[PDB]
Amino acid sequence: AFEVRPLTSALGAEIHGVRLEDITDADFAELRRLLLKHLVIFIPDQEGWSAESRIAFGRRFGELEEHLPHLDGHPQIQIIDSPIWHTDMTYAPNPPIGSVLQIVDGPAQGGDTMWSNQYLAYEGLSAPLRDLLDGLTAVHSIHIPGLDSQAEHPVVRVHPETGRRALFVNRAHTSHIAQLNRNESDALLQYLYRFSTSPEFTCRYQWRPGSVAIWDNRVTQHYAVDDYHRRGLRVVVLGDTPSGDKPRWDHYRP
Amino acid sequence: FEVRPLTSALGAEIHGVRLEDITDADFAELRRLLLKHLVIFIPDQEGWSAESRIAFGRRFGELEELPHLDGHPQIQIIDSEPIWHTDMTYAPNPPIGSVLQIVDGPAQGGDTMWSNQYLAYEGLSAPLRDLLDGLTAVHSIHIPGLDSQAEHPVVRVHPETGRRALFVNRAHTSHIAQLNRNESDALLQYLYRFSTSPEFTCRYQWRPGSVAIWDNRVTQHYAVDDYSEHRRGLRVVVLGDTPSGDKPRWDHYR
Ligand SMILES: [Fe+2]
Ligand SMILES: [Fe+2]
């Protein structure tokens, strides 16, 4: 078994002795299990990871997103270049399952990424509040010049592979709770965003060249710190369907 | 009687009344108006006798007996020597109502506002009402010479109307027992702000001789602090309330 060095009690772990290039299905299974346990894993010293290897590794988890700048003749490998808590693309009915990011160059310090644990954010709530959120759904939307999209998702979702409940609201894309009036929804979401990202549920990763970060976009939010040029390669695994309880109330009608 | 309501929410001014020698039949109508309007205002009751006042108040229940009129501890004196509150909710048996007459004061300033706790509750969406029905709160007071506390349902049923009404107020409610203190604070903040919106309140302007009778079971009152003129008033406090509601749906937080 690999050597694991966790970041925080909540989530994140650095995995050592991994060579993603010609990795075996057996070693990959151990990584899928560590991802489920730790929610976000960091594999350092992966400089020189080939395009074909990056593809097949992402392809192990599911379907990749294809285009946004990409490596020549590899639209599944995105080019990240150059500050709010968010869960990737939740304004869509089927948000991504997870992502694989590799910082290929940059400064030794500055540009840290933080991740939060939505299992603990849900568990941390008291029982009357956890019951209330189980029967609620929220609309997630984005309205920029080249995109007007939205999607309803339960406030509390179950991880399909863990069977554990997680909060499914994020400051960036969550618009409003459907079954509550806009005012009640504002007040409740304001508390939930503050709560869900309290230090106890997060981890902060300092990037090093060659570092790979693979995370679960079902049970985490992430935040890129604006404390500092940086380039990275990102593969996006799609296929999420945030499922939860049947809402116990009709949509709020004004 | 001539009845002139202040707002759609609560409050009505009654004309053509003489409290001094009121009949049981006219009082039956006042009692009906108090249950319909929550706070009623009776003007031109100057020189109302002390024994008549005590016989009138005794029609609702037992009177409280400190500054009082000579030979009458049942009649408290308020000689003015700024927060939404329901009277003595920190006690296990808060009062059901009060009868206050303004003997002498300025023409403007010192207006008192009242709010409808029935509307405060109804105005919440279905999921919020469900939550509050199964919750209770500790109401406390901590000053030199008076250290009392009591737990009351967040939503209570008025024993005469059968109607549910919110039972939390900024001045005396400390926290909701079944939630942690942070969730409790956040929820109460929305609640105090909401329960007192203009739509649920009324503002009465006092004139020497005006009498206000109110239902402390389903109202909050506020004393506007905007005048430097001395104002004397005479209060008769009716005791006997036991705020009842639904048994908590969860245990107290740990
Ligand atoms: Fe992202
Ligand atoms: Fe008062």
Can you spell out the DSSP letters for A127-159? HHHHHHHHT-EEEEEEEETTEEEEEEEESEEE-
Q: State the Cα–Cα distance between residues B243 and B192, nearest whole angstrom.
A: 19
Ligand 1 centroid, distance to A103 Cα (angstroms): 14
Q: How many structural domains is chain B composed of?
A: 1
Does the distance separating the beta carbons of B189 and A183 come in below 8 Å? no
Q: Is B235 annotated as a binding residue?
A: yes
Q: How many other C-beta atoms are found inside a 10 Å radius of the C-beta of residue B14?
A: 21
Taking CB atoms within 8 Å and a gap of at least 24, the contacts of B53-56 are B53/B19, B53/B99, B53/B101, B53/B234, B53/B236, B54/B236, B56/B19, B56/B22, B56/B27, B56/B99, B56/B236
Q: State the Cα–Cα distance between residues A122 and B226, nearest whole angstrom.
A: 46
Structure tokens at A60: 């192990």
Q: State the Cα–Cα distance between residues A34 and A12, nearest whole angstrom.
A: 10
- Please say whether the beta carbons of A233 and A141 come within 8 A: no
Q: Is A86 annotated as a binding residue?
A: yes
Question: How far are the Cα atoms of A18, A71, A75, A77 from residue A50, in angstroms, in the given order?
Answer: 15, 11, 14, 11
Helix axes A182-196 and B181-195, enclosed angle (nearest 10): 160
Q: State the Cα–Cα distance between residues B171 and B137, nearest whole angstrom.
A: 13
Question: How far are the Cα atoms of A83, A88, A203 from residue A227, in angstroms, in the given order?
Answer: 10, 21, 16
Phi, psi of A234 (to 5 degrees): -130, 130
Q: Is A162 annotated as a binding residue?
A: no
Q: Which of B182, B246, B247, B252 to mutate to test the interface with A (most CBs of A within 10 A)?
A: B182
Is B85 a known active-site residue? yes
Phi, psi of A194 (to 5 degrees): -60, -50
- Please say whether the beta carbons of A46 and A210 come within 8 A: yes
In chain A, residues with a C-beta closer than 8 Å to the C-beta of B191 are none
Phi, psi of A132 (to 5 degrees): -65, -45
For A128, the closest of B125, B134, B189 (CB atoms) is B134
Does the distance separating the beta carbons of B135 and A250 come in below 8 Å? no
Q: State the Cα–Cα distance between residues B212 and B33, nearest whole angstrom.
A: 13
**What is the span of the domain harbouring residue A174?**
1-254
Q: State the Cα–Cα distance between residues B232 and A54, nearest whole angstrom.
A: 83
Provide the residue type at A60 as one letter: R
